[PDB]
Structures are given as structure tokens and as C-alpha cells.
């Protein structure tokens, strides 16, 4: 109940909201259907439009009037946005050159440069050049002040997940907007786009921007806009605001667009329709700086000017039904569209089987336009999985298509041609940012970044401290002039026991072989010094990874490879080595097969045995550092110790063994020299952080060997790749994959074949950053380049996503 009988007069955009049953004046009264019987007539005028013309300058003030073209209305803060241009001989903002703003200009009393960050929904990154002729004040701040050419939303690219997430500098998966609709198993409750469900607070989590800045003193405007108050009035609204007293003016602000999203799904990304819309936004924004201007506030205020996601060509008639697979249909609940989450219908249906399903759905159809997952199969680069809201059922969607339940469901509920919400890093999806204001950079292209990475900054260029996100603070400094976040290294943890020879070789009784007994000062001198470190420098490059927790480990140093081995799981949290451009692929000789020796430097109570990998009828095991790549046949040996071994199912042994006997070198040709780091990752609870030794689910069977639930590699190079890996004198280069360490292939459709023809299009899926292999090893790598700490946090962010260009 509202008692709508109070007044808005002088309270129209109040920031402080009032509790209900008194009626509210804010700008989003209109969503609860809440306002005062009158804000409509006082607060949404509209008489006259939203323009001076010549025969305005000067008039009497009429408080009826939208805005204002009266001597007065400077010093009252509600001119319209082209008053001085008509009025007084001035020019529009878009037509001055630009100027390099080296320090802030804002008038007495401001404490600080305010920020107003100007949220365009489905603004795909590729309009800023397509339609950059008819955007010219766009194209202005794009050009003069600090931009990428594209930047990553978060997956689902969706609306409120990309909102929340720029808000908070959190995944989905942790704020808790994981989808336009939710089911909340615990609090039984229904989220949807329409109606009132969504503004219970229990769904938003993390600490929003608007919060952090209020609880550190920080006024901030009201973020949130109904739908029906035109642009224009937002617009006038927020200059209204920044007129205020010192005591009372907001330091932060938000403008949000619907467009070009509203007309994207209805034309398609690039509809003749579509040139309209990006027109309207580029007169809004110069409305904006004008009014800035006006106030003299265009060389004082950071504006942010930023996108949710993109927007594909996507119609009816690309729909896949899962009546077409299912016998079973009318049993489910399916989310639908450019994703599909599936749960039980009932929870009482015991005959429901999730893995039936699954099977039910996987490469049925030749050019099948979806993918089934259990949510821990996704690519761990979504970070899509630890929320009770997201279903255990996942589909994965090609872009341009959809998913649905049964026909009726998408005639009966073509009228669209254009949607989104597909994986993060398909390129229609990527979308927009430009940084313009006295504490971003001139003329400054940065490379893309994740939308996480914003509230850090959002944080530092309002001088407070954010709360804990999964941005990487300091990784987007190289975008500011000043306010830059300077880090320290973490501290690193356990430090490592450097064990020499210390055990006979018949202590081991571990069930292993090896025709090894093919036994001279000159080369044993040598081989002991490879032992003690001698060739570590170029296999470690970038110092040895620092670990983050307390454990007990070993550094293990070889002719061909150094390693991190742990006593607690087993083997090697890490295994780096270097393959320079001209380095030569081996085999493992035949009376290698299956050989396993044990590592003297390890105690038989600290290894594997091979009994166990006899016994287990499903897992078999490989190898961190490849035998293929071993510098000579002497150092090939080093290879088969059982401290370089790993459990790995035969399926996967597929994907490693071409990973390491054809890609590696690949990449070393083209890279000239690559360094490699590998290792396991347990994520048993698929929270995306390192597992304690308690949460493991799965041993080699009768041991106390654990199994990964992945593998991961980061491969390092030159930028400059003129220079060789181990002799790189600047910027480094990287990719990194994290692969589902998974008993079947039956994510690749086409694994039949030939690995050539499918391992590597599985590796590109499980591209991942260094930052997300630090997350789940507890590891931190790069501790020692001649490269600024700023820079490798860069780095780290790097995702190598294998699209073509934008
Ligand atoms: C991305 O960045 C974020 C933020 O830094 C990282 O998320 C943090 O990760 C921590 C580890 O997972 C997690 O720490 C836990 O906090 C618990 C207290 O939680 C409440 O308070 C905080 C602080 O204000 C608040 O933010 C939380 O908000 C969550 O919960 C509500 C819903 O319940 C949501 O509205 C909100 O969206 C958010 O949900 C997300 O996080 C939770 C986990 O907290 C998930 O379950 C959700 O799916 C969703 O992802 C909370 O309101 C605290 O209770 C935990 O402590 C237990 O475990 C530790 C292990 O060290 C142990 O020492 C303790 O003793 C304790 O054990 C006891 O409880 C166990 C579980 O019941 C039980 O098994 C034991 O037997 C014991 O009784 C824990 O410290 C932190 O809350 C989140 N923060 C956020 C905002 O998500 C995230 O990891 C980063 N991601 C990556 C990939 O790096
Ligand atoms: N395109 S879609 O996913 O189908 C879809 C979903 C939801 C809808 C839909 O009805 N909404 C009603 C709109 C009113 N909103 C609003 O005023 O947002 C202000 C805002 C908030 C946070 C921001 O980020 C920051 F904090 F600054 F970092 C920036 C701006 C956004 C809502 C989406 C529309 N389309
Ligand atoms: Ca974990
Ligand atoms: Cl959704
Ligand atoms: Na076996
Ligand atoms: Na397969
Ligand atoms: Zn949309």
C-alpha cells in the first residue's frame, strides 16, 4: 500500500528513498508504482521540448517549461543544454578541438573530479568504428580520451549479470545474477525480468559501487532510471544534481541507455533500422558534455562510457528443440534461448536422471547448434558454476542460435533478429569502453580487458578502498594518468625443502620397472651439477612460482626441466621448461614403453607407485615434462622418474600426448622458443580456487594419489618475437589453457578422428589467464622479470581468445 496523497514539490529526484507507505519522488518510484499524485506534472515536465531557440534567450522563467532559456537558469542549474550555444555565442563541446586535460578544472568546493558513468545497453564494440560518421561526440571522447578497441563482458552476456558485474567487480556466479530469469531453490523464489520479484534484495549480492561509496562518505547519485522517464530528463536530472551545495552534491552518477539493445533484438545487429538509435545516443552524450560545459565542469569530470555486451543476428527459424532429443520432455524445466539450464520439473519425480539426459542430448545431430555440460565441465574461463541458481544442467549455445523446450514455445509465446547472451568470448558479444577526464589518459588505446577489472577502478578514481571482487587491482593502471593502485607481491607462504640424493634404490617397492641398468668423470661431474641447478635458468625464466599456502614441497632441478614437487598430493604442483625455436622431437624408445623410475631424492613414503595404475582399471597415467622434447637420450631418462608422473585417464591421454609431442613445439616455431609451466588443478567443489587436501572426491584406486580434476599449461614467450624466449629483453606474450581432466571425449563430436583435426579446437574452448591457474593452484607466477609489477598483472588478466579480429 501507498498512500500516493503527499506531494513532490522541491523533492522531485530525492536521492533518499522514503519507506513505504509515504509516497516517493526518486527515479525509480515509477517501477513500484509508488510516486506522488504529482511527480508526474512537477518532476516529468516536458512543455516546450528539451531545446532553447533564439526566441527563448532571455524570457521570463516559466516554471512550467522542461528547462529553462532565462538569465537566470545558470546560477538556478536547469538550462537547457544548448543555452549557451543559442543564447550566448558559444560553441557545442563536439566542436572544440580537443585539449589535453592534465589536471583537474572544477570549480570551488568541489573535493574531488566527479564520476558519471554512461551504461549503453547492446552497444557491440564494433559500432565505435561502423558507425563512428554518425557518432561524432562519441567519437570525440573515444579519440581524445583513453579506449580499447573492444571490451569482455561476463557469460551470461545478458543485461543485469554485465550490470551487477560492473558494479560490484564480481562474477555471476558470486553476486548472484546469474541469468535475466532464476529459480533460488533455498528461498523457493522466481526471478524474472517482468514484475516485482527482481527488487527483493536477497538476489543482489556483493557490495555495488553505489554502497562502497556511501559507506566511505562518498554521496552518490541513484544509479537506477524507470523506463519512462525520457533520456532527456535523465540527462537534466544529473547536471540538476551536480548544481547542488558542496554538502549535498553526489560525487557519483549513472545514465543507462536501453539503446541500441531495444532496437538490436528487433533488427539485428546492423539493421538499416539501427543507424537511428546510435545517432539518438551520440546526441545525448553531446547534450551531456554540453551541459558539462555549461557548467564549466567538461575539463573536471571522468566520464565512463561503457557497455553490458553486444548483440548476433539470431531469428526464430535457428532454433533447436529439445522435444526433437528428449523422450522424457514434459519432466524438465528448461531456461531457454541463448543458453539452457535445465532442472527437474518436480523434485518428487524419482524416475528424473540427469545423466540420461545429458546422453540424450550429446552429439545426436551432425551439426548440432548446442552442447550439453554438468556445470564443472564448463570452460573454467565462465567462472559459471558455484551458485545454487545455476542449474547442475548446462547448454552451452552456438552463436546465431537458440534453444527451446518444444516448438509451441517460440510461436506460441518470426518477430526478432537479433539477441545475445552467448559465451563471453564470441566477438558479437564484446562491447564498448572509453574513459574521458582528468585522471584517465590523452589519446591512449589500451588493450581489451574484462568488465571485472572496472569497479577497481571506478574505486580508485573516487579515492575509496573497494571491497573484495575478482578484478586483479593494479592490472588496469596503464588507463590512468594518476590514482594508479600500487600493489606488493603476495607474500609467498611455505618455502621449499631442496633435497639431495638421500634414498637407495631398493627402498622402493612401488611396483615400477625401467631398463635403466645401461650404465667417467668428465659427464658425471655434469650431470650432478644439473642436478643441483645448473641449467635452472633457462628452464625458469620468471623466477620460480611462489606458493601462497602452507604445504611441504620440494624443488626437483633436471638437465631439461625444473619442478614443484608436493609431498602432500603426490607430484609436481608445477613443471617448467624451456623448447627453444630450434629444439628436436623425440620418441620414448621402445625399451621406454613403460618405464617408471624412482627419484632418490623422494622418499618411497612421498611417491606414486605403479601397483596402483596396474589396479585401476580405468586411469593410466602421463607425464608433466614431455620424454618427447628431452635435449639428449642421457637426459631422457629424467623424464620417466615417478616424480614427473601424473594420473590421467587414457581418454585424456589423447589430448596430452598430442598436446606435448605436436603442439608444443608448434607454438615454439612460431613464437620463437616458448617457455612452459604445467601442473594439476583439483577443483572438486567447482568454487575455482585451489582445493585443501580434505576436498578431494577421487584417488587412484587403493592409493592415496589424488586425481586432478585438470591440467593446466601457460606458455610464455617474446612479444618481440624477433628475440627467443629465454633471451627476451621486454614485454612478454602468453596463452594458457586449463583442460578437463575427463574420462571420455565426449565434449568433441568429432574425436574419432585424427587429434589434428580436433585437440586444439578443444584447447582454444579451455583458453584460460594466468590469474584464473594462480586462483586454483594457490600459485603466483612471474615473481621475477625486469617488467613493471603493474605490467605482469596485466599479463596475468590475458586471455588469448582465438577470434578473429573485431
Ligand atoms: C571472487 O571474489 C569473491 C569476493 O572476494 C570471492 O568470494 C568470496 O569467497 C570466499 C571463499 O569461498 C567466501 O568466504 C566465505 O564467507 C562466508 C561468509 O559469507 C557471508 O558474508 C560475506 C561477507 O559480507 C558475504 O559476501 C557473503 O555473500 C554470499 O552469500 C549470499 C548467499 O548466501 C549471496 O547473496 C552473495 O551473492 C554471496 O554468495 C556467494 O558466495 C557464497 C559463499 O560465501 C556461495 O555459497 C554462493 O554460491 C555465492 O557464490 C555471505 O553473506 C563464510 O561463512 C565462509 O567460511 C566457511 O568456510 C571457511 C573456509 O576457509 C572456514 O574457514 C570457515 O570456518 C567456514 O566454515 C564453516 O562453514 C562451512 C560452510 O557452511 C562448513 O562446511 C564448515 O563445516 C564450517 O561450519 C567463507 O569464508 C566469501 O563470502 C565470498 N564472497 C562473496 C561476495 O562471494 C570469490 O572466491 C572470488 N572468485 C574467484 C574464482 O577467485
Ligand atoms: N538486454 S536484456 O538482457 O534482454 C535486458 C535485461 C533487462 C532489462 C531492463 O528492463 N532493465 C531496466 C533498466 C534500468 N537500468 C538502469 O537504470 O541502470 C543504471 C545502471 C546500473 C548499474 C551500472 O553500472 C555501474 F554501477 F555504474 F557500474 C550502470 C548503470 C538497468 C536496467 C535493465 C532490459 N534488457
Ligand atoms: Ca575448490
Ligand atoms: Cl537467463
Ligand atoms: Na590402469
Ligand atoms: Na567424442
Ligand atoms: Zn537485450
Given at each position: 500500500?501507498?498512500?500516493?496523497?503527499?506531494?513532490?514539490?522541491?523533492?522531485?529526484?530525492?536521492?533518499?528513498?522514503?519507506?513505504?507507505?509515504?509516497?516517493?519522488?526518486?527515479?525509480?518510484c515509477?517501477?513500484?508504482?509508488?510516486?506522488?499524485?504529482?511527480?508526474?506534472?512537477?518532476?516529468?515536465?516536458?512543455?516546450?521540448?528539451?531545446?532553447?531557440?533564439?526566441?527563448?534567450?532571455?524570457?521570463?522563467?516559466?516554471?512550467?517549461?522542461?528547462?529553462?532559456?532565462?538569465?537566470?537558469?545558470?546560477?538556478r542549474?536547469?538550462?537547457?543544454?544548448?543555452?549557451?550555444?543559442?543564447?550566448?555565442?558559444?560553441?557545442?563541446?563536439?566542436?572544440?578541438?580537443?585539449?589535453?586535460?592534465?589536471?583537474?578544472?572544477?570549480?570551488?568546493?568541489?573535493?574531488?573530479?566527479?564520476?558519471?558513468?554512461?551504461?549503453?545497453?547492446?552497444?557491440?564494440?564494433?559500432?565505435?568504428?561502423?558507425?563512428?560518421?554518425?557518432?561524432?561526440?562519441?567519437?570525440?571522447?573515444?579519440?581524445?580520451?583513453?579506449?580499447?578497441?573492444?571490451?569482455?563482458?561476463?557469460?551470461?552476456?545478458?543485461?543485469?549479470?554485465?550490470?551487477?558485474?560492473?558494479?560490484?567487480?564480481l562474477?555471476?556466479?558470486?553476486?548472484?545474477?546469474?541469468?535475466?530469469?532464476?529459480?533460488?531453490?533455498?528461498?523457493?523464489?522466481?526471478?524474472?525480468?517482468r514484475?516485482?520479484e527482481?527488487?527483493?534484495?536477497?538476489?543482489?549480492?556483493?557490495?555495488?559501487?553505489?554502497?562502497?561509496?556511501?559507506?566511505?562518505?562518498?554521496?552518490?547519485?541513484?544509479?537506477?532510471?524507470?523506463?519512462?522517464?525520457?533520456?532527456?530528463?535523465?540527462?537534466?536530472?544529473?547536471?540538476?544534481?551536480?548544481?547542488?551545495?558542496?554538502?549535498?552534491?553526489?560525487?557519483?552518477?549513472?545514465?543507462?541507455?536501453?539503446?541500441?539493445?531495444?532496437?538490436?533484438?528487433?533488427?539485428?545487429?546492423?539493421?538499416?533500422?539501427?543507424?537511428?538509435?546510435?545517432?539518438?545516443?551520440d546526441?545525448?552524450?553531446?547534450?551531456?558534455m554540453?551541459?558539462?560545459?555549461?557548467?564549466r565542469?567538461?575539463?573536471?569530470?571522468?566520464?565512463?562510457?561503457?557497455?553490458?555486451?553486444?548483440?548476433?543476428?539470431?531469428?526464430?527459424?535457428?532454433?533447436?528443440?529439445?522435444?526433437?532429443?528428449?523422450?522424457?520432455?514434459?519432466?524438465?524445466?528448461?531456461?531457454?534461448?541463448?543458453?539452457?539450464?535445465?532442472?527437474?520439473?518436480?523434485?518428487?519425480?524419482?524416475?528424473?536422471?540427469?545423466?540420461?539426459?545429458?546422453?540424450?542430448?550429446?552429439?545426436?545431430?551432425?551439426?548440432?547448434?548446442?552442447?550439453?555440460?554438468?556445470?564443472?565441465?564448463?570452460?573454467?574461463?565462465?567462472?559459471?558454476?558455484?551458485?545454487?541458481?545455476?542449474?547442475?544442467?548446462?547448454?552451452?549455445?552456438?552463436?546465431?542460435?537458440?534453444?527451446?523446450?518444444?516448438?509451441?514455445?517460440?510461436?506460441?509465446?518470426?518477430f526478432?533478429?537479433?539477441?545475445?547472451?552467448?559465451?563471453?568470448?564470441?566477438?558479437?558479444?564484446?562491447?564498448?569502453?572509453?574513459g574521458?577526464?582528468p585522471?584517465?589518459?590523452?589519446?591512449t588505446?589500451?588493450?581489451?580487458?574484462?568488465?571485472?577489472?572496472?569497479?577497481?577502478?571506478?574505486?580508485?578514481?573516487?579515492?575509496?578502498?573497494?571491497?573484495?571482487?575478482?578484478?586483479?587491482?593494479?592490472?588496469?593502471?596503464?588507463?590512468?594518468?594518476?590514482?594508479?593502485?600500487?600493489?606488493?607481491?603476495?607474500?609467498?607462504?611455505?618455502?621449499?625443502?631442496?633435497?639431495?640424493?638421500?634414498?637407495?634404490?631398493?627402498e622402493?617397492?612401488?611396483?615400477?620397472?625401467?631398463?635403466?641398468?645401461?650404465?667417467?668423470?668428465?659427464?658425471?661431474?655434469?650431470?650432478?651439477?644439473?642436478?643441483?641447478?645448473?641449467?635452472?635458468?633457462?628452464?625458469?625464466?620468471?623466477?620460480?612460482?611462489?606458493?601462497?599456502?602452507?604445504?611441504?614441497?620440494?624443488?626437483?632441478?633436471?638437465?631439461?626441466?625444473?619442478?614443484?614437487?608436493?609431498?602432500?598430493?603426490?607430484?609436481?604442483?608445477?613443471?617448467?621448461?624451456?623448447?627453444?625455436?630450434?629444439?628436436?622431437?623425440?620418441?620414448?624408445?621402445?625399451?621406454?614403453?613403460?618405464?617408471?623410475?624412482?627419484?632418490?631424492?623422494?622418499?618411497?613414503?612421498?611417491?606414486?607407485?605403479?601397483?596402483?595404475?596396474?589396479?585401476?582399471?580405468?586411469?593410466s597415467?602421463?607425464?608433466?615434462?614431455?620424454?618427447y622434447?628431452?635435449?639428449?637420450?642421457?637426459?631422457?631418462?629424467?623424464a620417466?622418474?615417478?616424480?614427473?608422473?601424473?594420473?590421467?585417464?587414457?581418454?585424456?591421454?589423447?589430448?596430452?600426448?598430442?598436446?606435448?609431442?605436436?603442439?608444443?613445439?608448434?607454438?615454439?616455431?612460431?613464437?620463437?622458443g616458448?617457455?612452459?609451466?604445467?601442473?594439476?588443478?583439483?577443483?572438486?567443489?567447482?568454487?575455482?580456487?585451489?582445493?585443501?587436501?580434505?576436498?578431494?572426491?577421487?584417488?587412484?584406486?587403493?592409493?592415496?594419489?589424488?586425481?586432478?580434476?585438470?591440467?593446466?599449461?601457460?606458455?610464455?614467450?617474446?612479444?618481440?618475437?624477433?628475440?627467443?624466449?629465454?633471451?627476451?629483453?621486454?614485454?612478454?606474450?602468453?596463452?594458457?589453457?586449463?583442460?578437463?581432466?575427463?574420462?571420455?571425449?565426449?565434449?568433441?563430436?568429432?574425436?574419432?578422428?585424427?587429434?589434428?583435426?580436433?585437440?586444439?579446437?578443444?584447447?582454444?574452448?579451455?583458453?584460460?589467464?594466468?590469474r584464473?591457474?594462480?586462483?586454483?593452484?594457490?600459485?603466483?607466477?612471474?615473481?621475477?622479470?625486469?617488467?613493471?609489477?603493474?605490467?605482469?598483472?596485466?599479463?596475468?588478466?590475458?586471455?588469448?581468445?582465438?577470434?578473429?579480429?573485431?
Amino acid at each position: 500500500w501507498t498512500a500516493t496523497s503527499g506531494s513532490c514539490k522541491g523533492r522531485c529526484f530525492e536521492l533518499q528513498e522514503v519507506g513505504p507507505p509515504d509516497c516517493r519522488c526518486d527515479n525509480l518510484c515509477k517501477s513500484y508504482s509508488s510516486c506522488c499524485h504529482d511527480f508526474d506534472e512537477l518532476c516529468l515536465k516536458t512543455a516546450r521540448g528539451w531545446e532553447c531557440t533564439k526566441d527563448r534567450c532571455g524570457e521570463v522563467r516559466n516554471e512550467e517549461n522542461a528547462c529553462h532559456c532565462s538569465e537566470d537558469c545558470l546560477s538556478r542549474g536547469d538550462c537547457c543544454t544548448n543555452y549557451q550555444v543559442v543564447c550566448k555565442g558559444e560553441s557545442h563541446w563536439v566542436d572544440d578541438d580537443c585539449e589535453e586535460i592534465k589536471v583537474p578544472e572544477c570549480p570551488a568546493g568541489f573535493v574531488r573530479p566527479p564520476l558519471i558513468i554512461f551504461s549503453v545497453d547492446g552497444f557491440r564494440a564494433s559500432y565505435m568504428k561502423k558507425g563512428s560518421k554518425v557518432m561524432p561526440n562519441i567519437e570525440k571522447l573515444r579519440s581524445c580520451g583513453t579506449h580499447a578497441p573492444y571490451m569482455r563482458p561476463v557469460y551470461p552476456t545478458k543485461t543485469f549479470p554485465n550490470l551487477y558485474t560492473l558494479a560490484t567487480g564480481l562474477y555471476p556466479e558470486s553476486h548472484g545474477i546469474v541469468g535475466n530469469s532464476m529459480y533460488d531453490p533455498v528461498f523457493d523464489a522466481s526471478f524474472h525480468l517482468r514484475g516485482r520479484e527482481k527488487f527483493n534484495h536477497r538476489w543482489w549480492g556483493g557490495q555495488p559501487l553505489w554502497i562502497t561509496a556511501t559507506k566511505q562518505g562518498v554521496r552518490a547519485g541513484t544509479f537506477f532510471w524507470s523506463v519512462s522517464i525520457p533520456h532527456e530528463r535523465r540527462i537534466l536530472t544529473i547536471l540538476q544534481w551536480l548544481s547542488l551545495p558542496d554538502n549535498e552534491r553526489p560525487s557519483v552518477y549513472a545514465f543507462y541507455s536501453e539503446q541500441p539493445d531495444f532496437s538490436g533484438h528487433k533488427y539485428g545487429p546492423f539493421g538499416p533500422e539501427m543507424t537511428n538509435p546510435l545517432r539518438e545516443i551520440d546526441k545525448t552524450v553531446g547534450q551531456l558534455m554540453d551541459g558539462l560545459k555549461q557548467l564549466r565542469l567538461h575539463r573536471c569530470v571522468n566520464v565512463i562510457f561503457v557497455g553490458d555486451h553486444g548483440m548476433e543476428d539470431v531469428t526464430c527459424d535457428r532454433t533447436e528443440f529439445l522435444s526433437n532429443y528428449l523422450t522424457n520432455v514434459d519432466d524438465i524445466t528448461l531456461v531457454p534461448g541463448t543458453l539452457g539450464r535445465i532442472r527437474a520439473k518436480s523434485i518428487n519425480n524419482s524416475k528424473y536422471d540427469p545423466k540420461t539426459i545429458i546422453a540424450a542430448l550429446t552429439c545426436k545431430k551432425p551439426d548440432q547448434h548446442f552442447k550439453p555440460y554438468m556445470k564443472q565441465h564448463l570452460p573454467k574461463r565462465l567462472h559459471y558454476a558455484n551458485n545454487r541458481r545455476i542449474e547442475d544442467i548446462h547448454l552451452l549455445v552456438d552463436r546465431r542460435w537458440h534453444v527451446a523446450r518444444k516448438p509451441l514455445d517460440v510461436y506460441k509465446k518470426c518477430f526478432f533478429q537479433g539477441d545475445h547472451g552467448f559465451d563471453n568470448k564470441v566477438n558479437s558479444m564484446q562491447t564498448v569502453f572509453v574513459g574521458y577526464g582528468p585522471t584517465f589518459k590523452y589519446r591512449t588505446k589500451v588493450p581489451p580487458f574484462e568488465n571485472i577489472e572496472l569497479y577497481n577502478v571506478m574505486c580508485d578514481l573516487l579515492g575509496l578502498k573497494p571491497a573484495p571482487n575478482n578484478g586483479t587491482h593494479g592490472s588496469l593502471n596503464h588507463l590512468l594518468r594518476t590514482n594508479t593502485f600500487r600493489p606488493t607481491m603476495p607474500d609467498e607462504v611455505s618455502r621449499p625443502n631442496y633435497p639431495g640424493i638421500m634414498y637407495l634404490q631398493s627402498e622402493f617397492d612401488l611396483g615400477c620397472t625401467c631398463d635403466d641398468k645401461v650404465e667417467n668423470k668428465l659427464e658425471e661431474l655434469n650431470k650432478r651439477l644439473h642436478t643441483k641447478g645448473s641449467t635452472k635458468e633457462r628452464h625458469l625464466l620468471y623466477g620460480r612460482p611462489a606458493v601462497l599456502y602452507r604445504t611441504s614441497y620440494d624443488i626437483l632441478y633436471h638437465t631439461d626441466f625444473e619442478s614443484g614437487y608436493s609431498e602432500i598430493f603426490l607430484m609436481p604442483l608445477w613443471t617448467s621448461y624451456t623448447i627453444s625455436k630450434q629444439a628436436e622431437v623425440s620418441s620414448i624408445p621402445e625399451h621406454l614403453t613403460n618405464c617408471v623410475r624412482p627419484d632418490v631424492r623422494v622418499s618411497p613414503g612421498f611417491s606414486q607407485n605403479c601397483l596402483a595404475y596396474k589396479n585401476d582399471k580405468q586411469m593410466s597415467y602421463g607425464f608433466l615434462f614431455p620424454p618427447y622434447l628431452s635435449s639428449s637420450p642421457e637426459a631422457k631418462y629424467d623424464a620417466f622418474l615417478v616424480t614427473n608422473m601424473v594420473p590421467m585417464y587414457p581418454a585424456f591421454k589423447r589430448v596430452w600426448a598430442y598436446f606435448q609431442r605436436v603442439l608444443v613445439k608448434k607454438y615454439a616455431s612460431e613464437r620463437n622458443g616458448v617457455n612452459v609451466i604445467s601442473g594439476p588443478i583439483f577443483d572438486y567443489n567447482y568454487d575455482g580456487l585451489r582445493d585443501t587436501e580434505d576436498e578431494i572426491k577421487q584417488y587412484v584406486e587403493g592409493s592415496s594419489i589424488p586425481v586432478p580434476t585438470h591440467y593446466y599449461s601457460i606458455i610464455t614467450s617474446c612479444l618481440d618475437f624477433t628475440q627467443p624466449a629465454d633471451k627476451c629483453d621486454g614485454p612478454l606474450s602468453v596463452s594458457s589453457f586449463i583442460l578437463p581432466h575427463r574420462p571420455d571425449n565426449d565434449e568433441s563430436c568429432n574425436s574419432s578422428e585424427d587429434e589434428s583435426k580436433w585437440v586444439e579446437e578443444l584447447m582454444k574452448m579451455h583458453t584460460a589467464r594466468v590469474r584464473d591457474i594462480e586462483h586454483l593452484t594457490g600459485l603466483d607466477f612471474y615473481r621475477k622479470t625486469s617488467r613493471s609489477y603493474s605490467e605482469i598483472l596485466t599479463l596475468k588478466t590475458y586471455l588469448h581468445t582465438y577470434e578473429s579480429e573485431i
